[PDB]
Amino acid sequence: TVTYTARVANARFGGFSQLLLLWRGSIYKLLWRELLCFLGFYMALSAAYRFVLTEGQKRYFEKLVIYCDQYASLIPVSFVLGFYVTLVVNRWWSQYLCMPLPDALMCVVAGTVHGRDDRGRLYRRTLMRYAGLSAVLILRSVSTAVFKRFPTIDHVVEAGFMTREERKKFENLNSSYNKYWVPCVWFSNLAAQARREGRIRDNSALKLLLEELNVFRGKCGMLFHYDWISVPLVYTQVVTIALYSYFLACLIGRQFLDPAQGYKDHDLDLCVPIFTLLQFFFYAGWLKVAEQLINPFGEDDDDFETNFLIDRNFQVSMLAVDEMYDDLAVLEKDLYWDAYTFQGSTF
Amino acid sequence: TVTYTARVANARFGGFSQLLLLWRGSIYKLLWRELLCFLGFYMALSAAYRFVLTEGQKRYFEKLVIYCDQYASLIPVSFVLGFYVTLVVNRWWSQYLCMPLPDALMCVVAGTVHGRDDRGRLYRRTLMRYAGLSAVLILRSVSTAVFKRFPTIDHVVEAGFMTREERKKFENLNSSYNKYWVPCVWFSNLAAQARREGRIRDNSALKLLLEELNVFRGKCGMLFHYDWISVPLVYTQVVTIALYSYFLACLIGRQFLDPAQGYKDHDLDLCVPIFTLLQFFFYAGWLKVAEQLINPFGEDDDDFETNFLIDRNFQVSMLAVDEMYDDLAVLEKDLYWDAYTFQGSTF
Amino acid sequence: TVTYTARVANARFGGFSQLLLLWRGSIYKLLWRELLCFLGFYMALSAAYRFVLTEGQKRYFEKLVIYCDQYASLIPVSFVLGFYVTLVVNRWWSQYLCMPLPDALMCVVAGTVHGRDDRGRLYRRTLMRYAGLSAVLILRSVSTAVFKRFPTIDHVVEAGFMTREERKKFENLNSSYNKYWVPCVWFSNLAAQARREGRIRDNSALKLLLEELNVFRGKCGMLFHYDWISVPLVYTQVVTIALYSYFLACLIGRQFLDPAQGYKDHDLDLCVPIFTLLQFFFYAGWLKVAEQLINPFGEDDDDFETNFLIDRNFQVSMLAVDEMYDDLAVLEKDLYWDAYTFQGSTF
Amino acid sequence: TVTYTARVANARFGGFSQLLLLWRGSIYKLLWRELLCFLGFYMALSAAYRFVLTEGQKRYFEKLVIYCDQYASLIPVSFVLGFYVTLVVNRWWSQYLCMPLPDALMCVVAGTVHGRDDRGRLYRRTLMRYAGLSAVLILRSVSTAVFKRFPTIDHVVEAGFMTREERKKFENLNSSYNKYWVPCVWFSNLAAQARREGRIRDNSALKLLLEELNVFRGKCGMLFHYDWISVPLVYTQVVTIALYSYFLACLIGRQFLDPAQGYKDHDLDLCVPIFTLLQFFFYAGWLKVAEQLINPFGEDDDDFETNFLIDRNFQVSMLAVDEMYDDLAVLEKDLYWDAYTFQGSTF
Amino acid sequence: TVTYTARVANARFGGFSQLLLLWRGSIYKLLWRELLCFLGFYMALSAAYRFVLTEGQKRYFEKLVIYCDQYASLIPVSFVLGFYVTLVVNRWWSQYLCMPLPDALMCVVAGTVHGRDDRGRLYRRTLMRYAGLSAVLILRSVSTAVFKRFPTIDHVVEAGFMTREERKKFENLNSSYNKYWVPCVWFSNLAAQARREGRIRDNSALKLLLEELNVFRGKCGMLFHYDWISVPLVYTQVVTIALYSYFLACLIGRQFLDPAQGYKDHDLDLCVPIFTLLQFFFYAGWLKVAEQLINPFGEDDDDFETNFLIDRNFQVSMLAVDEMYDDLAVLEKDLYWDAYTFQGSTF
Ligand SMILES: [Ca+2]
């Protein structure tokens, strides 16, 4: 994730110009290889046309260039690319909203799971750790960065997310399917045990805990669903072929022809297809942004900071339910007890 | 479902190029017959024009080719196809989200339906099986793959989803309408019996069970609604006719005319309508993706793995509420009891 | 509603071709009169131009035809029609989702309203009948088919949805506004009476009943709101005028001119405006689909089966809360008590 | 609001033609002045060109007309207008859904706030009146029609929505911000008093009342938010300037030039720019529909019937919670106690 | 925020014309510098072409102008800008809906946290202040205006949102991540203390408080998420480059060429590219509106009134839960105890 929200807080004269000088998370970083390859093939064709081909071969090549320039428009590149990129961007923001956060659960656990003794601390810390462990299991399932951090369950145990007893129980469970849900069932069992023990003082508090756990588990499941149900491979194939075929057609049809031949709209030889290069930049860049966003759990610059989120979620959850439990400042009268650096349209 | 999420985790130089070599779930698999038929009709017309027709018939055919090339644009193929495909894709993802999953219910049942004895196991297993049975009944109603797996209720009974006593009760119910809802009413009755028996310890836990059951039943009902209320047949007819009429017009108007006649934009005979074939590829491919996605419960490669989901849901539900009930590891102090391989914009 | 979900489960070679032979719910059924009228006016103009007008009148008519062909593009038909049809289709699916279904309520009532005696049966049947009666009142308010079935409240009483005592109470209520909500208030009162009587065993069950009743009543209200707040009449007028004006312009500008006059793009007289007819087919068909979908509660083929839904909802509700109450098969150990015909991306 | 849902229930031969004869809520009513002004300026320019200007001034004017006709396309009128109108229409339907309705609250109050005595009637009537008063305060804040009906709080007191004691409390509250929320806080306090008094029999019923009150208050707040956060003024300015500049360009570039000069596409003088007038009709009409819908709380024909809704909501709420409380017909066996004028795809 | 809802309540003859005279929140204010710079570069190029370049250099410049005019269309400016602006506007309204409001919480607190004594006042005021403090912490994290108002936590303490004891607890918490959530955990702890003390009278009221707190905290978290996950920098770079490259191309290709050279569509020298300036106005204005809306928490005229909202929320919350607690007017019979200045389609 490359944040630039601060840089664009106010609409200024050089508003988006200053963002063109960024390299991390940039279009240039994602596209310089493809742009160089396109320019290389174009210059190879241009050198062949200018120096290698005979006069008759040049006339045939010019006829082919005009044909491919005219009929390259029949490729619905804008049509297919717009649809695909809209679908990918919607999925991208939806997938970010699907990452499970323990904030709701840590508020509820701090409010509902009671006891200053070691057992109360154990209950609160274990509930938040089960939530974190479910998040880690699904994230290492769906995120290449989290997988590289946790390539085995041994790594997850060594990171403190899973104990060795919990590891024995987890691997002893006979299932061929993804086990990210297992800590959520542990959470439900532990919440029921805590309520039966009296650590949870009422049935409504237990109901709230289970509702927030189900929201968290739904988010983990939704991450699994987005990972499994890819954007239909046929859409990806079609848009990739559309871009490739259109730009091979442009490699042919955007060549500068000899202005001595008096071909219409062919009288200025600039030797470098500046607009064709800009059109490639924009269209191939759009597809590269979809390429980068299609799996936002990879290791691209604008991919989600999944490992940062794991560390932040674990630290904040443990702070919220252990350090901060029943740790209020004494109720003190505020500044305005005895009270800087629009009403409506029809009034 | 053909997953390729891993292959596109990072935006790489050969980003989407390597996905063009896939055959399962590909555009080539869905479109090679239609592409061959279009090319066959085009080559039949081309052979007739080149070898069969007389000179006067050739001049008339060339006038007709230019007319059909000019006025084939009056068919709003892009207009109708874009609308249709957007509607189908929205319905497709909505329909995937509508498939009932027992994860919420199995978390709640593991947390709320109590007893290590045989009767507690029976209650939890039976509640999850009623949920699974409702899912199976609606899925065999809406999915051709699940129907082929369960062509009779006898098959469902033999698969263990329905008992023989439950089969007698189910067929003895006098209703001409789809009975997928019957196990949900069984679930409500059984949850009430469990609460009255004391297996469910509080009224709030029963309320949570009934709320999650209603979410599950709503998902089953929504699957029935999507199966019943098709994309309006008039849209499907209109887009099919648009594609067919446009490409028959192109079969006429994209023919290569004799360059000796000096027709404008007709001076290069390539004998194979490469761009017209690419345009057919993209437009007919878009319609074929809508064709494949319009009923995502068929047996296409990118159709949902409904039978896999049935097996996974049943196995995971039975694991969650029977093997995993009250089966926590002893509460153990974690690694950070005494504590790898952004703050904001305005700071 | 014309369902064809089964016919398109798999993407086949003749995928959407076989749906072009359907007549019920077809574009041909909605559009053959308009297509015939357009063709009749076109042939009247063509016959006048070919046989009636003098040479000077023919030259003036040809100038007018070229003018109207050129400047008919200034009508934003695609612009206005796309916006309108998207709005109508969104409203159409939203309106289908707004039809009240008693499935949630019948699950809750079967789970919560207790007693095998006649009084328990009366309570459950009466609650589901109040829900059904609210649905019938709003549906006869908004649906022409349901109104034809229930043109008076006498018809509703004779159908068993309302008793005669309830009819006296209903007509004795002094209100000039639609009374579809009245049975929902009866439902709330009856649920409170049932809870006070002990038929509902707990306050949380009563709360769940009232929440599901409010969901049902919200759906009835939303149906009233969609019926009242039409698609803005100005949009309907604008799109109707756009289609009509554009196709009158085409009636003028698509005429085949005498090829002897050597007008550019006028040298092939086909005597039948095949593409213009296809363009009319697609554009007028799009507007006709919006026409049919704009009120999905009429008697069009693809309009909702409101009377079928009323009968199904009543029968299934009465089955669920009367026949099926506390009527479980004895808890029996399933087949897998002692256990046919993907893990993640990063693994 | 101009309802025409009934007129379009069935897709008929003269489907949308009969709606073109409506004047109330019509495009003609909103656009006849602008259309007359555009036609007046066009005819002034036409008369100047035909009668006033000299030959050289005519040649210069013809060059300018051709220039402005060619380059008027550079104005993205379709681009900006489509975006703006989609945003306005989405906000319009969202704003209609945001109008608070007391139906949920009146169902809950009839079910939960008990007592046939005068005090129970007072509690139910006062709770529904607080809801109605919050609706009236925000509506007179946001709606010009409701403001004209209630230009002072004295008017609201005289209408029975606020008592004089409540008026003293309301004006004695020291706040510079909109006080529409005040009756909602009164509602919360009164609901707590009713529960403490035993009129509300359980804590879950009080929780349901407060949840429905918060839904109602959220709707009032959302109306305030939509009134405050206008569609960004820069969008409105940009689209207004786009329409105005484009049609001034058309006032220049759509002039009929002397056909004797042999200008291409200028050989038929119709003296009335029929298509240009139709294009103005459609584009300016689209902007006028956005103009009318942008504040749907004004006094346009298709603006919401806010005063009708206030009267209906008050009357129906008072009927529901006072006349209809505990006023059921005796539980009577229905017609089908001893039982007119699709199963699935894969079956 | 520049509200103009009142000015457009009714669709009037001069409907949007009168909004073109506004300067605050206007397109002119955001765009006059860019428009002046574009016009300056254009006039520099025009002066060079008219006075400086030789005849041969003029002929080459004219060839380049025609080339750049023809092929500037290959830049998908409309394509990329439409996508970007739609994404930004959706995020903009979503971000406005994500600003936490204490209205739900103040209704619940006034209804549920009891006691007229000093301790009850302290509990209610402290709960609302914790909510306000969470809002302030996240807003100074995400909003430049709120940061300028609260550049240190010392400023927040001096404003009365945080006490000094709470400041000691807040800074003593060991966390490297944003601490906006801390007051929400304080809220959960304080609500639990209030329920345990008997100030909250029932467990369902505590559950409602925690649910509304979690809604509030979710809104604060969502503000953090929108601030962190910017619109992908690659989209911003691509659209900025598209606008810049297209308008540099227009700086070249929109130059008025010497009409003596008889270049087609170059025969009228207006010396000022009025349409090109209008096209720049619209396209650059669209991008400037996205620039202004992309971070709606800056100090632009149409940016959200975050400091006004902070002051309003604090004042209204303190009014609602302190002044207005248990402060009803005596239950009085309303005006219509003994009862001005549509039924349905199918009736
Ligand atoms: Ca990625």
Ligand SMILES: [Ca+2]
């Ligand atoms: Ca399929």
Ligand SMILES: [Ca+2]
């Ligand atoms: Ca209809």
Ligand SMILES: [Ca+2]
């Ligand atoms: Ca209005």
Ligand SMILES: [Ca+2]
């Ligand atoms: Ca800003």
